Amino acid sequence: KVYNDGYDDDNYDYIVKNGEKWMDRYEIDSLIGKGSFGQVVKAYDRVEQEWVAIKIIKNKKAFLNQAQIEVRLLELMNKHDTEMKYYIVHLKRHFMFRNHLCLVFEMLSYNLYDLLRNTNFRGVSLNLTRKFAQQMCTALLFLATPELSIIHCDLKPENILLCNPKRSAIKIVDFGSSCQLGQRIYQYIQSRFYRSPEVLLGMPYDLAIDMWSLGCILVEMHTGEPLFSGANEVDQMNKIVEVLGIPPAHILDQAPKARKFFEKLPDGTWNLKKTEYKPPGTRKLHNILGVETGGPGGRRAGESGHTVADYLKFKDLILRMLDYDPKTRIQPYYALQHSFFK
């Protein structure tokens, strides 16, 4: 009949109501988010006199525990002194309310997928993309702090929100999937479009996966379409090979799931399993970005800072981010010194 005295529903989470007032402080406006973890709502803090986004976790043990892990992480980040902290979303405070866990975040604006949908999926200028890229590389540089060593494990355009609708400042949200570096416990991680090959191949992984995701994002921010948009993992790997080529033999010799996509020939060489696709490595990123053809689809022809040189810097950096070897993949600190950011 009723659950938690009629406050929750079938899915253990709070039924939000327009204009409801909590604890004589927070004033609920409207639902803005919904996920497996629970719900996200827009509200007005009366004490700080400001708008905040509150994360209400479901009324279950599991979700509560996960949320507590996440809270510990956020608090851990907020305790560090560097300005690099200001690219991670800020957890002002947290509390319990009617058997629910509530996380108080600063209210942010649109996520990047919204913007992309506003361009009719044509992407944005390279000048803006440079700014986004810079800030993101800074954030990943912060998360790599020895005492932190945090892997976001779920970087996608909808997890990057604007601070202000009229400024190019962004921030990273939802650290529920988050992970501090350590021994492997999970193997089905990251979003499918942004899942690093070492994960697709069932191999050990570190922070280098985030970088991979970032590489898939920036290009998508300029073209409007996902770089690799496979319906499944096979299609995904095929689409990654289609652009970057078949992985190094020394990589595939280590990969347990290597034979999910490949087969080993009698001469030791690896080849794709047939299931559609271009020959490996003939979908050149050079042609995808339209370096010498006036940008993606020729819609950036004649625009400021859209010369061949700029596109070549960009392409070099992106190819440094999509390195197959996690050991040789470009690191944030060196990424911030690229000619792209001059």
Ligand SMILES: CCC(=O)Nc1cccc(C(=O)c2sc(Nc3ccc(N4CCN(C)CC4)cc3)nc2N)c1
């Ligand atoms: C949309 C939220 C999301 O994808 N992940 C997420 C989950 C839980 C909390 C947060 C988070 O930190 C947020 S979410 C937020 N405000 C916000 C939430 C939702 C939205 N929209 C969601 C997408 N709609 C098409 C437009 C409005 C816009 C802004 N501020 C913070 N600080 C983000």
